[PDB]
Enzyme design. Structure first.
Site, PDB file in Angstrom:
ATOM      1  N   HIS A  61     -26.985   7.524   5.895  1.00  0.00           N
ATOM      2  CA  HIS A  61     -27.082   8.942   5.541  1.00  0.00           C
ATOM      3  C   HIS A  61     -28.446   9.255   4.915  1.00  0.00           C
ATOM      4  O   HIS A  61     -28.983  10.345   5.103  1.00  0.00           O
ATOM      5  CB  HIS A  61     -25.965   9.345   4.569  1.00  0.00           C
ATOM      6  N   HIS A  91     -32.458   8.750  -4.183  1.00  0.00           N
ATOM      7  CA  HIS A  91     -32.579   8.917  -2.750  1.00  0.00           C
ATOM      8  C   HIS A  91     -33.170  10.301  -2.492  1.00  0.00           C
ATOM      9  O   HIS A  91     -33.370  11.094  -3.421  1.00  0.00           O
ATOM     10  CB  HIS A  91     -31.210   8.812  -2.081  1.00  0.00           C
ATOM     11  N   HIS A  93     -33.371  13.798   0.476  1.00  0.00           N
ATOM     12  CA  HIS A  93     -32.915  14.547   1.641  1.00  0.00           C
ATOM     13  C   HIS A  93     -34.155  15.192   2.235  1.00  0.00           C
ATOM     14  O   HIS A  93     -35.033  15.646   1.498  1.00  0.00           O
ATOM     15  CB  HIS A  93     -31.896  15.632   1.242  1.00  0.00           C
ATOM     16  N   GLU A 103     -32.112  20.631  -0.342  1.00  0.00           N
ATOM     17  CA  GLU A 103     -30.728  21.051  -0.474  1.00  0.00           C
ATOM     18  C   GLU A 103     -30.666  22.308  -1.337  1.00  0.00           C
ATOM     19  O   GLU A 103     -30.221  23.365  -0.878  1.00  0.00           O
ATOM     20  CB  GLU A 103     -29.902  19.906  -1.031  1.00  0.00           C
ATOM     21  N   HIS A 116     -33.323  13.050  -5.436  1.00  0.00           N
ATOM     22  CA  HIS A 116     -32.196  13.026  -6.371  1.00  0.00           C
ATOM     23  C   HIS A 116     -32.170  11.720  -7.138  1.00  0.00           C
ATOM     24  O   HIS A 116     -31.975  10.653  -6.543  1.00  0.00           O
ATOM     25  CB  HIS A 116     -30.877  13.194  -5.606  1.00  0.00           C
ATOM     26  N   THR A 195     -23.516  16.371  -3.232  1.00  0.00           N
ATOM     27  CA  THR A 195     -23.833  17.163  -2.044  1.00  0.00           C
ATOM     28  C   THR A 195     -23.445  16.464  -0.742  1.00  0.00           C
ATOM     29  O   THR A 195     -23.670  17.011   0.349  1.00  0.00           O
ATOM     30  CB  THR A 195     -25.313  17.522  -1.972  1.00  0.00           C
ATOM     31  N   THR A 196     -22.866  15.270  -0.847  1.00  0.00           N
ATOM     32  CA  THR A 196     -22.285  14.587   0.313  1.00  0.00           C
ATOM     33  C   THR A 196     -20.834  14.269  -0.002  1.00  0.00           C
ATOM     34  O   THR A 196     -20.460  14.181  -1.172  1.00  0.00           O
ATOM     35  CB  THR A 196     -23.001  13.254   0.653  1.00  0.00           C
TER      36      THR A 196
HETATM   37  N1  LIG Z   1     -26.603  13.903  -3.068  1.00  0.00           N
HETATM   38  S1  LIG Z   1     -26.098  13.599  -4.523  1.00  0.00           S
HETATM   39  O1  LIG Z   1     -25.253  14.689  -4.910  1.00  0.00           O
HETATM   40  O2  LIG Z   1     -27.215  13.264  -5.356  1.00  0.00           O
HETATM   41  C1  LIG Z   1     -25.070  12.162  -4.428  1.00  0.00           C
HETATM   42  C2  LIG Z   1     -25.168  11.187  -5.409  1.00  0.00           C
HETATM   43  C3  LIG Z   1     -24.318  10.094  -5.360  1.00  0.00           C
HETATM   44  C4  LIG Z   1     -23.390   9.972  -4.349  1.00  0.00           C
HETATM   45  C5  LIG Z   1     -23.307  10.942  -3.372  1.00  0.00           C
HETATM   46  C6  LIG Z   1     -24.147  12.043  -3.400  1.00  0.00           C
HETATM   47 ZN   LIG Z   2     -28.619  13.666  -2.865  1.00  0.00          ZN
END
Ligand SMILES: NS(=O)(=O)c1ccccc1
Ligand SMILES: [Zn+2]
Length: 257
Positions: A61, A91, A93, A103, A116, A195-196
């Site tokens: 992802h 990570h 996006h 996002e 993030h 957000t996932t």
């Molecule tokens: N994308 S996010 O909200 O930072 C996220 C963080 C940890 C797990 C899944 C999603």
């Molecule tokens: Zn994220």
């Protein structure tokens, strides 16, 4: 399984994860004129000097840079937060083109990408327990625009060749996440969600106002990653962002006047 394709993307997620249509979903559009300065916010403290990175992983992802969170090494405190939140991973996006990828949006503006930095509230003992709590997580979000290169990002960029496909990982020790921050810590904050999938409503979002600049060449290398596993038809890892969700009964607060 969920993803970002036409068949399994954000418009489909609600069928497996009903909370997708919930009351505090992320991301959101940040309407800068409606956000209000909040004098009750304490100074934000990003303390990453003792961070211990371990590994970088393509999870199909995005890619995660993972940290040792067994002790209070890299932590986030202050701002809207009560107590101490430990860094577990970061990570990004990003988009297929420079005009999309973030996002969160700012007055409907989409940035090329969004970083993030994910933290969990130490009062809950572990990440798994933290995601059963309304104040379990804090995610520090940072926008990326395309311009000059970000020197502190280059080590990440250069290792991506080794984790091209889903399930691949590589050693990634001694990486300093301080090199990914902008100069200013001015921010907006609101209560939201992952957000996932599983889209859990556990996050205090802290979104920095100042974007970082990365070079076209740096973001181009993000776009060479694959959603697929080794030996499978190539599907470029691009447009791995969820669009803005309804604000509903929430207010976005600003740290700055
Ligand atoms: N994308 S996010 O909200 O930072 C996220 C963080 C940890 C797990 C899944 C999603
Ligand atoms: Zn994220």
């Amino acid at each position: 399984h969920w993803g970002y394709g036409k068949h399994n993307g954000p418009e489909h997620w609600h069928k497996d994860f009903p909370i997708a249509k919930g009351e505090r979903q992320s991301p959101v559009d940040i309407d800068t004129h409606t956000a209000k300065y909040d004098p009750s916010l304490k100074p934000l403290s990003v303390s990453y000097d003792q961070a211990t990175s371990l590994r970088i992983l393509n999870n199909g992802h995005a890619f995660n840079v993972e940290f040792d969170d067994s002790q209070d090494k890299a932590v986030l405190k202050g701002g809207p937060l009560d107590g101490t939140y430990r860094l577990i991973q970061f990570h990004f996006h990003w988009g297929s083109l420079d005009g999309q990828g973030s996002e969160h949006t700012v007055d409907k503006k989409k940035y090329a990408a969004e970083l993030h930095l994910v933290h969990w509230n130490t009062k809950y003992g572990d990440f798994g327990k933290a995601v059963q709590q309304p104040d379990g997580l804090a995610v520090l979000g940072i926008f990326l625009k395309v311009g000059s290169a970000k020197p502190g990002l280059q080590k990440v960029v250069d290792v991506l060749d080794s984790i091209k496909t889903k399930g691949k990982s590589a050693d990634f020790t001694n990486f300093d996440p301080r090199g990914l921050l902008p100069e200013s810590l001015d921010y907006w904050t609101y209560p939201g969600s992952l957000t996932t999938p599983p889209l859990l409503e556990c996050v205090t979002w802290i979104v920095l106002k100042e974007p970082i600049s990365v070079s076209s060449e740096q973001v181009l290398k993000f776009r060479k990653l694959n959603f697929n596993g080794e030996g499978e038809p190539e599907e470029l890892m691009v447009d791995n962002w969820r669009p803005a969700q309804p604000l509903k009964n929430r207010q976005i607060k600003a740290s700055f006047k």
